[PDB]
């Protein structure tokens, strides 16, 4: 855990925009 | 166009001096202290002084003033930027910025000052790059300084490829005494701690309103960042062409982009405070805090500062949730709340005495500032879409990011 | 996907209940991944919707589309931006490649009645990209 | 926490209480205070400043803070209003022209929101001449019954004799202390 909000994984790019 | 960059102290003694052009005599620093004292005592004190034909432009540090003398029509903005870069380099090299390290790190301090700027024109300012050529515990300079990429040293290898992001929000509200908010702006801050192998070219992608409009998806929740300030690694041309945020992340923690857009929504925390201050008899503080944020978000470490009287004594706090303590050093009541669930309402009833003898001079009405910090809550609604980590060797990155919502210049004007 | 299968009937019922024509904030699930919908994911979702039914032939509405996008985001973590249709008038193709769902007339493009129609050629032919190359970059 | 020490102290008497001495000049306030403390009619010069004394009776330290009735000291009564629990008003029934001034001063002192818990204590001073009024005519003239949320009690005390001081002290103790 960590104060200020748990870290979340990020995507690689806009998969819906090609 | 600084003539001599010097570091002063609280007693007027120059801890360290390093002339760059020699056009200003080293004895002019002695008159800087009397000039600063005269300016402070008359209300005309400014960061840029003027000793006849020589201007002493410098900023105020934690314990010493980094005054940089100049004689010609040098760029004040350039001098300020050089001073800020020097302060950042000192902070990176030395964990403390005080007189304890000035007199103990002179051997490396002199070398850093000499290498940073020559003839008044700075050339190297990257702490990470500068740490490979000037150390306090010498090889040839790294090719990063000579190469175009001066913010990412080549050859960096790590066991894992993890990049931690930090979407820190700054909720600043300027609420007047009439109850209306005048300045309500939210400044984003995307600080990432990139730790990867090699020199990856990060391709940051977010749900920007401009990008959504260009792609044709200008109908969902998009962050309308009025001003976007990218870092040095971020390519300005790529962002100006098609809103492409492509840059090489540095090794360590650094600020990639700093969004800043106005906010037209209601404040997350609403403070309804009253002042039933009797004429030299007593005072009442009917302060009520209303949380307008979402109930799913909790404002951890909520500290709504209520400015109490300076000469108030024997105060009593009648609150509901959270501990209320009065600090005589700050002359205010700190309404500290550990956990503040969204939609909660905390009511406090202050009661403090007052001396019979009236004060000789007025003390003013400092604004009430809250210290709410709700993690995992993005007020602007901006969400990261993708992060294109591309490396020539080829590796599977594991990017990470967290959203933190806090209070910036969230002050409330008093009556 | 057991969760997706369970949510499909409730989502279809909610969409049917809403006619064809209060809380502030944007909470985010802790540790829940958020990313745009992929072409393979869009194709799988379209195939699942076609097999289960309730989406093919249903009257297209803003409320129903928003509810479906919100349910998809909740059950999968996909941003509600890939469920976009090409501007009218006429048949609107999905903006995101791989989507098998499209809007076709049922009778100003805003007042034209549109319904969701399955189209397997959407996952293979970039009709939306070809129609709007500028929007695809 | 433990309150055994407090109970032990209260078993033999712990409460002390406070009191105030205000009123017009030459109203017997200094003489009344001297009689309460010592028990003799001591002649003193007019109180330019103030006199502070204490009286020990009924196991309660009744501290008396005499305040003069001078014009320059009339607005100085607010200094003693801080950390004050009691208040005693000394009327001057032998001064018909000064009766209105004393009533106005009492009304001004009683019209402050800081002094609310101090119960009214009207003492009929100079109760030795035939011109002195009774215990009801003075109260009726001063309108003591119209003081909302004020517990006032009119008592006649003779400065030369000292009669009625014990009754006033008992009334003050009963108003301050609400125990057996
Ligand atoms: N002879 C006589 N004089 C009284 C009596 N009661 C009040 N006085 C008058 O009241 C005055 C009392 O003054 P002090 O005892 O010195 O104190 P005080 O009442 O506060 O008067 P100031 O000091 O002027 O404020 C005396 O000078 C008397 O003239 C009384 O019963 N007999
Ligand atoms: Mg006297």
Number of other residues whose CB lies within 10 A of the CB of residue A16: 28
Nearest ligand 1 atom, CA D43: 16
Q: From B12, B405, B338, select the one nearest B172 (Cα to Cα).
A: B405
For residue C82, what are the CA distances in angstroms to A18, B192, B244? Answer: 10, 27, 19
Name the minimum distance, in Å, from the CA of A12 to any CA of chain C.
8
Q: Give the technique used to solve this structure.
A: cryo-EM
Q: Evaluate: CB of D167 within 6 angstroms of ligand 1.
A: no
Dist. CA B263–CA B173, nearest whole Å: 9
Structure tokens at B107: 């051997």
Whether residue B281 and residue D112 make contact (CB cut-off 8 A), yes or no, is yes
**What is the spatial distance between Cα B348 and Cα B316, in angstroms, rounded to a whole number?**
10
Q: Nearest-CA neighbor of D22 among D60, D75, D62? A: D75
| Nearest protein CA to atom 16 of ligand 1, as residue | D44
Q: Is C76 on the interface with A (CB under 8 A)?
A: no
- What does the buried/exposed string (b/e) look like for D140-153 if buried means 16 or more CB atoms within 10 Å of the residue's CB? eebebeeeeeeebb
Does the annotation flag D31 for ligand binding?
A: yes
Write out the residues surrounding ion ligand 2, Cβ under 5 A: D 30, 47, 66
Here the tokens at position B25 are 């005599």
- Cross-chain residue pair D112–B280, CB shorter than 8 Å: no
- B275 DSSP 8-state letter: B
Task: Give the residue among D78, D76, D122 at the shortest CA–CA distance from D103.
Answer: D122
Identify the CA nearest to B298 among candidates B377, B194, B361.
B377
| Neighbours, chain A (3 or more CB pairs < 8 A) | B, C
List the structure tokens of B203. Answer: 């391709």
The DSSP call for residue B234 is: B
Burial of D68 (C-beta count, 10 Å sphere; 0-12/13-18/19+): buried
Sign of the alpha-carbon dihedral angle for B220, B223, B227, B229: negative
Residue of the CA atom closest to atom 5 of ligand 1: D126
C28 part of contact set with chain A, CB < 8 Å: yes
Distance between CA atoms of B84 and D169, rounded to whole angstroms? Answer: 75
Does residue D70 have an active-site annotation? yes
**Ligand 1: which of D21, D30, D35 to mutate, judged by most atoms within 8 Å of the beta carbon?**
D30
Distance B372 CA to ligand 1 centre (A): 64
Q: Is D140 annotated for ligand binding?
A: no
**Helices and strands, number each (H, E), in chain A:** 0, 1
Nearest to A13 among B377, B386, B400 (CB): B386
Question: If you write DSSP's letter for every residue of chain D in order, what string do you get?
Answer: ---HHHHHHHHS-----B--BEE-TTSSHHHHHHHHHTSS-------SSEEEEEEEETTEEEEEEEE---TTTGGGGGSTTTT-----EEEETT-HHHHHHHHHHHHHHHT-SS--SS---EEEE-TTSTT---TTHHHHHHTGGG-TT----EEE--TTT-TTHHHHHHHHHHHH----
Q: How far is the CA of B71 from the centre of ligand 2 (A)?
A: 75
Which of C81, C73, C65 is closest to C34 using CA atoms? Answer: C73
The minimum CA-CA distance between B367 and chain D, rounded to whole Å, is 28
Token representation of residue B387: 């992060």
In angstroms, the first-to-last Cα distance of chain A is 35
Point out the ligand 1 atom lying closest to the alpha carbon of residue D29.
19
Residue nearest to atom 12 of ligand 1 (CA): D28
Cβ atoms of B48 and B65 within 8 Å: the answer is no
Between strands B313-319 and B345-353, the pairing is antiparallel
Between the CA of residue D90 and those of B286, D71, D113, D146, what are the distances in Å? 39, 16, 21, 18
Residue owning tokens 């967290």: B402
B372: tokens are: 């709410």
Which tokens go with B208?
A: 């920007």
DSSP code string of C38-103: PHHHHHHHHHHHHHH-SSTTPBP-HHHHHHHHHHHHHHH-B-TTS--B--SSS-B-BSSTT--EEE
Chain D CA closest to residue B282: D114
Residue D174's contacts (CB-CB under 8 Å, 6 or more residues apart) are none
Cα separation, D69 vs D74, in Å, equals 6
Question: Would the CB of D24 count as within 6 Å of ligand 1?
Answer: no
Chain B residues whose CB is inside 8 A of the C132 CB are 216
């Amino acid at each position: 855990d960590r104060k200020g909000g748990s870290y979340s994984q990020a995507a690689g790019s806009d998969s819906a925009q090609s | 166009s600084a003539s001599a960059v010097y570091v002063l102290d609280l007693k007027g003694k120059v801890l360290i001096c390093r002339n760059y052009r020699g056009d200003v005599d080293m004895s002019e620093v002695e008159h800087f202290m009397p000039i600063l004292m005269e300016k402070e005592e008359e209300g005309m004190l400014s960061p840029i002084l003027a000793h006849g034909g020589v201007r002493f432009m410098w900023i105020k540090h934690n314990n010493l003033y980094l005054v940089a003398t100049s004689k010609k029509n040098a760029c004040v903005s350039l001098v300020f930027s050089f001073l800020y870069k020097v302060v950042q380099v000192f902070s990176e090299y030395f964990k403390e910025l005080e007189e304890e390290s000035i007199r103990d790190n002179f051997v490396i301090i002199y070398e850093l000052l000499d290498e940073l700027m020559d003839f008044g024109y700075p050339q190297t300012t990257d702490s990470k790059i500068l740490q490979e050529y000037i150390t306090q515990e010498a090889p040839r300079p790294p090719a990063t300084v000579t190469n175009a990429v001066s913010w990412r040293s080549e050859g960096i290898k790590y066991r894992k490829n993890e990049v931690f992001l930090d979407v820190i929000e700054a909720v600043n509200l300027l609420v007047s005494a009439n109850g209306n908010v005048l300045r309500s702006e939210i400044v984003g801050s995307i600080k990432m701690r990139v730790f990867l192998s090699g020199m990856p070219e990060l391709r940051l992608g977010l749900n920007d309103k401009v990008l959504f409009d260009n792609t044709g998806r200008g109908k969902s929740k998009s962050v309308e960042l009025e001003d976007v300030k990218f870092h040095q690694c971020v390519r300005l041309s790529r962002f100006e062409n098609d809103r492409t945020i492509s840059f090489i992340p540095p090794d360590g923690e650094f600020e990639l982009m700093s969004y800043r857009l106005n906010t037209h929504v209601k404040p997350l925390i609403w403070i309804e405070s009253v002042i039933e201050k009797h004429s030299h008899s007593r005072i009442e503080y009917m302060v009520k805090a209303k949380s307008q944020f979402k109930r799913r978000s909790t404002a951890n470490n909520v500290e709504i500062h209520i400015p109490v009287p300076n000469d108030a004594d024997s105060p009593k706090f009648k609150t509901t949730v959270g501990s209320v303590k009065w600090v005589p050093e700050n002359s205010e009541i700190v309404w500290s709340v550990k956990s503040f669930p969204g939609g909660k309402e905390y009511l406090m009833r202050a009661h403090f005495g007052l001396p019979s003898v009236e004060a000789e001079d007025k003390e003013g009405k400092p604004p009430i500032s809250v210290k709410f910090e709700i993690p995992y809550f993005t007020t602007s609604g901006i969400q990261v879409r993708y992060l294109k980590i591309i490396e020539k060797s080829g590796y599977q990155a594991l990017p990470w990011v967290r959203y933190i919502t806090q209070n910036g210049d969230y002050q409330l004007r008093t009556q | 996907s057991k969760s997706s299968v369970i949510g499909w009937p409730a989502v279809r019922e909610r969409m049917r209940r809403a006619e064809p024509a209060e809380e502030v904030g944007f909470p985010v699930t802790p540790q829940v991944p958020l990313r745009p919908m992929t072409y393979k994911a869009a194709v799988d979702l379209s195939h699942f919707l076609k097999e289960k039914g309730g989406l093919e032939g249903l009257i297209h509405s803003q409320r129903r589309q928003d509810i479906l996008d919100l349910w998809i985001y909740h059950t999968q973590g996909y941003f509600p931006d890939w469920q976009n249709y090409t501007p009218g008038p006429g048949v609107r193709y999905p903006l995101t490649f791989g989507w098998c769902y499209k809007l076709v007339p049922v009778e100003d493009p805003e007042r034209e009645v549109l319904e969701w129609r399955f189209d397997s050629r959407l996952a293979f032919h970039h009709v939306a990209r070809e129609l709007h190359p500028e929007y695809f970059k | 926490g433990n309150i055994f020490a407090n109970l032990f102290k209260g078993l033999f008497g712990k409460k002390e209480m406070r009191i105030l001495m205000v009123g017009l000049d030459a109203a017997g306030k200094t003489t009344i205070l001297y009689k309460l403390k010592l028990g003799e009619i001591v002649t003193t010069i007019p109180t330019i400043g103030f006199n502070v004394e204490t009286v020990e009776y009924k196991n309660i330290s009744f501290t008396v803070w005499d305040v003069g009735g001078q014009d320059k000291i009339r607005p100085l009564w607010r200094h003693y209003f801080q950390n004050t629990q009691g208040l005693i008003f000394v009327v001057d029934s032998n001064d018909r022209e000064r009766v209105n001034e004393a009533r106005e001063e009492l009304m001004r002192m009683l019209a402050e929101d800081e002094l609310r818990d101090a119960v009214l204590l009207v003492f009929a001073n100079k109760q030795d001449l035939p011109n002195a009024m009774n215990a009801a005519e003075i109260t009726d003239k001063l309108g003591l019954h119209s003081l909302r949320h004020r517990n006032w009690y009119i008592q006649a005390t003779c400065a030369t004799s000292g009669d009625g001081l014990y009754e006033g002290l008992d009334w003050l103790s009963n108003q301050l202390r609400n125990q057996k």
